From Swiss-Prot, chains A, B:
Range covered out of full length: 20 to 139 of 142
Native species: Capra hircus (Goat)
Keywords: Calcium, Disulfide bond, Glycoprotein, Lactose biosynthesis, Metal-binding, Milk protein, Secreted, Signal
Gene: LALBA
Main location as per UniProt: secreted
S-S bridge residues: 6-120, 28-111, 61-77, 73-91
Protein name: Alpha-lactalbumin
Tissue: Mammary gland specific. Secreted in milk.
Length: 120, 120
């Protein structure tokens, strides 16, 4: 389901200020990551990334493509392709605590200027 | 509107192989740039970027915010905010001639793996 900025804003409420990352910075990260598409799947030679947060199957969730995943989020990757963001959010917090915002942003400044434009 | 993978595939047909860039490579580029949204507008402290190709008002188009724009594409940035992609494409060709795919991609590798995933 392709979500709108405002719908995403509502749905990511429980991530607000988590780790010190504001809600507007979360919606921005989501835009640049999957364009608000809960079912986005992107493949690489090596891995595959799932849903809105583009969670990979080599470290975070378990795939048929890769059963030998470290599976930190202890979940099957396809749980990140539905409309329920609950489990996506739980996994997104570990990624933040383990690797930081750069998992998603190549440069942080990408989501630090004019943050009020992400406000719904 | 927020177009789907297949809608964008048909709409950018005009660009197939231009500068050597295959069609699946353009769809990949659009995904990563605007998430397929023709009305995306993103602001920086320095400039604003419009539409599908996130064309900036500092060098390519002109708007109320910055009149000192070099305006290489000789056009108003708001023409890059509707559902007709004809003029966006003509301007995207100029950017490709001048700066290359690196206007959109930090690393071309980003859009060279599993190109068949971007096929409709
Ligand atoms: Ca889910
Ligand atoms: Ca247009």
């Amino acid at each position: 389901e392709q979500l709108t900025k405002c719908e995403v804003f509502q749905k990511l409420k429980d991530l607000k200020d988590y780790g010190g990352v504001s809600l507007p910075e979360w919606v921005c990260t989501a835009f640049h990551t999957s364009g608000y598409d809960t079912q986005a799947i992107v493949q690489n030679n090596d891995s595959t990334e799932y849903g809105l947060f583009q969670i990979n199957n080599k470290i975070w969730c378990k795939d048929d493509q890769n059963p030998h995943s470290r599976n930190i989020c202890n979940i099957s990757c396809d749980k990140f392709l539905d409309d329920d963001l609950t489990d996506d959010i739980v996994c997104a917090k570990k990624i933040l605590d383990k690797v930081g915002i750069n998992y998603w942003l190549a440069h942080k400044a990408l989501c630090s200027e004019k943050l009020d434009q992400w406000l719904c």
